Every structure is written in structure tokens, then in C-alpha cells.
């Protein structure tokens, strides 16, 4: 399986380390960069009390029974709407 | 299959007893509950 490379006659750990630093890690830096310049933040979506969303058929069994586990006040409305 | 004669023979009288106790251990506690169903149904 090819895309622009050699390696097969004498190798091993050396070849794999080469691929770790020459290709794998730089891809991670490239994607991190690509991520870093899309951050800032994002327009909190408008609240519409859709009945297929914000399901409560039984309270959650922590806090006040109405907040999901990774609740984020900024972007996660309750069934009655965003919190003050 | 071949076997040695019983080391501790269970005679016909002993079988009768084994059989009786076995059957009663099943029938009594069940009969007791079923007999009293209505008493329970008047809950």
C-alpha cells in the first residue's frame, strides 16, 4: 500500500519512528492549527420549545432532576428555555 | 454398566418413606398457599 515512500529493505523501529515524527505528529499540529483558527465562540441557537427535544420522561437522578450531565447554560436550554 | 450391590441398601419400606417425604415437601407449602388464595385475595 503506497502514496509516496520506500523503506522495506532495512527498517523497523526506525521506520515507524520516522513515520511518527515525519508524518503522524505533523498532521496533528496541522489539524490543531486548523482547529485553533475556528474557535472563538458560536451564536447560541434560538430557543424553540420543540416537543421532540428536551425529553423528560423521568427526572435525572442528580441535581434538580432537570439538568443533563454536561449541561452548558450558554448553549443548552431547559424544557422551559435558556437559564437567566 | 455393571455395579457393586448397594453399600447401604434402601429397602422397600425405606423407599416408601423417601418417596412420601419427597412428595410432601412439594405438595404441602404449595397446597397451603393455594388453599389460602381467597384470604389473600381479600387484601
Amino acid at each position: 500500500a503506497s502514496a509516496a515512500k520506500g523503506d522495506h529493505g532495512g527498517t523497523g523501529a526506525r521506520t515507524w519512528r520516522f513515520l511518527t515524527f515525519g508524518l503522524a505528529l505533523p498532521s496533528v499540529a496541522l489539524c490543531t492549527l486548523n482547529s485553533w483558527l475556528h474557535s472563538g465562540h458560536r451564536e447560541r441557537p434560538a430557543f424553540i420549545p420543540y416537543h421532540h427535544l428536551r425529553i423528560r420522561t423521568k427526572p435525572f437522578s442528580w441535581g434538580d432532576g432537570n439538568h443533563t450531565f454536561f449541561h452548558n447554560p450558554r448553549v443548552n436550554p431547559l424544557p422551559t428555555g435558556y437559564e437567566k | 454398566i455393571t455395579a457393586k450391590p448397594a453399600k447401604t441398601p434402601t429397602s422397600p419400606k425405606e423407599q416408601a418413606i423417601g418417596l412420601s417425604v419427597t412428595f410432601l415437601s412439594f405438595l404441602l407449602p404449595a397446597g397451603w398457599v393455594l388453599y389460602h388464595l381467597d384470604n389473600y385475595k381479600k387484601s
Binding site: - | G18, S25, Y40, S43
Partner: protein, 46 residues
């Protein structure tokens, strides 16, 4: 080491046939009785 041979490779004793019989009778009878007592319990709960 563990005892080997007939009547030794089981977790209950068969040394006395009358004691065995009481045991089997508790063992099998409790399993048989259990559902009748679960039905009773549910009737009496209301």
C-alpha cells in the same frame, strides 16, 4: 489434597441417607415453594 471417589466430589454429604433426604427436600422444596410465596407476597401488597 481433596477427597476423591464416590460421594466425595460433591459439596453435600451423602454419608447418612436420612440427613441427605432432609437436605434435598429443603433444597428442591425451597425452589418449588418460592414462586407460590412470591405470588402470595404480591397479592398481600395489595
Amino acid at each position: 489434597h481433596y477427597e476423591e471417589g464416590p460421594g466425595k466430589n460433591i459439596p453435600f454429604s451423602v454419608e447418612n441417607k436420612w440427613r441427605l433426604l432432609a437436605m434435598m427436600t429443603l433444597f428442591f422444596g425451597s425452589g418449588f415453594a418460592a414462586p407460590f410465596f412470591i405470588v402470595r407476597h404480591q397479592l398481600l401488597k395489595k
